[PDB]
Every structure is written in structure tokens, then in C-alpha cells.
Ligand binder design. Sequence first.
Ligand SMILES: C=CCCn1ccnc1C(=O)O
Ligand SMILES: [Zn+2]
Ligand SMILES: [Zn+2]
Length: 231
Amino acid sequence: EYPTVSEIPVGEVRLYQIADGVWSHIATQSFDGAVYPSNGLIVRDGDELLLIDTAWGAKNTAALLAEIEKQIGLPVTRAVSTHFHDDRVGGVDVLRAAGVATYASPSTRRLAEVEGNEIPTHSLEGLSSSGDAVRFGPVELFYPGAAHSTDNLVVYVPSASVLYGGCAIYELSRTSAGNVADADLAEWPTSIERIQQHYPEAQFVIPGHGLPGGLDLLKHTTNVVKAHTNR
Ligand SMILES: C=CCCn1ccnc1C(=O)O
Ligand SMILES: [Zn+2]
Ligand SMILES: [Zn+2]
């Protein structure tokens, strides 16, 4: 059963097996007076592991590495952050100190710097225009266009039909847009349509926060975003 926010004290990390060689990682963090859960991805990359997103902060990210070593025991050699916010790059300095090569798009690295957040070392090329896709070991990285943020990426694991939507996709139980200070509300529905067109075969869909689902999370997220733009 997927771990929930109340089951994970801040500072601890759970791993959840989605498919052979594919895990989500789940952590919790305080934000604006409440504690929220947050998802990332782990994908077997031959004899190594590819990490998608930090565990939201230095301490959580150190716990993530310890849990990976305990439960999987292969080295995390590369990490990708899917946009510039702290639940995605917070902990990049810990990853770097542990030996992990960290990556993000040029826009993400730039927006991280402007924001005063941690900055992944390496720039991912080939993702500057809406609809661009690139291979990165066992996954495909896809820029769908502005949505939750202007730089947000999604990730697909072909071997298992796993779509990691990051913060551009809401879980089913989330019905209000909440915080969207960096969102492009006008573009978010269009960006989600590009995701649907490009990954019509996705069997598992992982939002940035909360419970995994299927392709219904896309239509669900457009409803929430549109309802919010109405007023
Ligand atoms: C989990 C929602 C609270 C707001 N929030 C905090 C961190 N990330 C987000 C997001 O909206 O994606
Ligand atoms: Zn964000
Ligand atoms: Zn987020």
C-alpha cells in the first residue's frame, strides 16, 4: 500500500516498488505551516541507479540515499531534477557530496540560481521547446511546456509504462490548485494535452505529491487548473 503523509515523519523516506527496477521514493516536508508528502523516482540503470528528483531537502535526501543503499544496494550515479523548486533540487548539494552527478535543463538551472536554490551541475540538452524529448539511460525526458512551472519536465520509463508527471500532475484527491505562484495557468491545460498525446500507453502515472494513478490524473489535473482559472 502506498505510504501516506501521516505515516512518514519529516526526515524519513520510504521506497515503493512500482515495477521491476522502478521505485518511487516518498518523503515529507513542512511548507506554509503544514506537512506534505512528495514523490520522486528511482530507476535501475544497468548496474547503477538513476534518481529522479531529490527528497525535498538536505536531510531527507541523505535519508533517501541511506534507504536506497539499505534496500536496493546499487549506486546512485546520476540524478535529474524536473524543475527548480526545493522539492526537486533541495538536496542536490548532498547528492553531489555523495558522488552523484546531478542534472537539470538549462532553464531549471537558471531558475534555481535566480531563486537561490541548489543548482544541479550538468545541463540537459535538447529540451528547450515544448514537445522535445531525449533519452537518458533507461528513461525518456519530456518537456511538455509551461504548467506548474515554466521549466517542468516529465519522465517516462518505457520498460514498465511508468509516467512520472512531477508537480504538473495532481493526485486524484487534490481538488484545489493551491499554490501556483510560478505556474502558467493559461498553458497548463495545453501542456497536459501534449503529455497525453505523447504517452498514450502509460499504465502508471505518478504525481509530484500524493497517490499514483493512471491517465485519469491528467484529465483530473486540467479540471482543477481550469476550475481555478475561472475565479
Ligand atoms: C503539495 C502541495 C503544496 C504546495 N507544494 C509544496 C511543494 N510543492 C508543492 C506543489 O504544489 O507542487
Ligand atoms: Zn514545484
Ligand atoms: Zn511540488
